[PDB]
Amino acid sequence: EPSILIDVPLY
């Protein structure tokens, strides 16, 4: 089962 890698912008 594959990893997810995401950028999460902040306020």
Next chain:
Amino acid sequence: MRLLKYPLDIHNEQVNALAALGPYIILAGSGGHVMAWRQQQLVDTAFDRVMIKDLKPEVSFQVGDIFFITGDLETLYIGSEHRLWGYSGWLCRDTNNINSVEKMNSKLLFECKSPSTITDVKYDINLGILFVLLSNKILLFRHKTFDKLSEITIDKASKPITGIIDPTGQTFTVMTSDRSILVYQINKTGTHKLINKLTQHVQMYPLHYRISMSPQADILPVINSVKGTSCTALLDRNNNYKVTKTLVTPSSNGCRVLVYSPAFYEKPNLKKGTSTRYNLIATSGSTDGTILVWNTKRMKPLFNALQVSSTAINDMSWSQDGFTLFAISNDATLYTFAFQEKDLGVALPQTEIKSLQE
């Protein structure tokens, strides 16, 4: 910030607890399994300096379902609902690498017999005391030796559901099934004194809670406060536990984790020539399986509460340096939130936290 979601290869098993200790984030759960990851390996993967196919725990071993893990650089305290083990010599002090279990010394520290169960285990490194909460007393043990120091007996109607460590080591706090917050003054000797009893303050559910107070020890956070239906609120420990801020309304009956970062951050506002010092809190929003990270100074979330899990979060732990948040649920997927300086600024020297405790 980068969020790395890493599904664990643990078949039907579950991870119930985790702890950031030394260079590692250590996961523990059903079937007695303990698995240790190098924090920096996960962070490096989140920023693509290494690839995802290389991820794997450095050491795994098997101790009953584990619900508690805490300790220091010399001892891991690993607990089920009925037994507490101490694993000493877990970290090679010369290389800063975790040892295999074959070089570890393991001792059965405590056993209770049904109907008794362990509701929580908390370790105060400054007092040198482990608190074992039982469903109805709190037991105080010296760390390492595990000599019994004292016992707090509380009412039959008051199950001690969870404990909260004081970073200054002067107190220990308990939240009870009959909705009380109990604050005890504790001495290193184990002697104790009830100094505050706040009744009808919190709605506790039959869960293992993971709550830590602010690193300055000025704020006690409460999940399901029923003062100020229920909400997640911050109480001023230096002003009679007055509510200072509400973070989540309504709080979920399934929310069991609210943990402060150990860091106290300063971020400049360069355009305006000013700067802000602040604390961070990780918890959930109103929906189970969300993760919310909250700036206590701006009193705003860093980002919209993020649905990461189909199930309630079981446990969360910040890295010691404050720039990584680790979280786990019944989805069996390790969540790593890897922050950068451009996100948060710079963690202040411990002098600044110590000045606010005094």
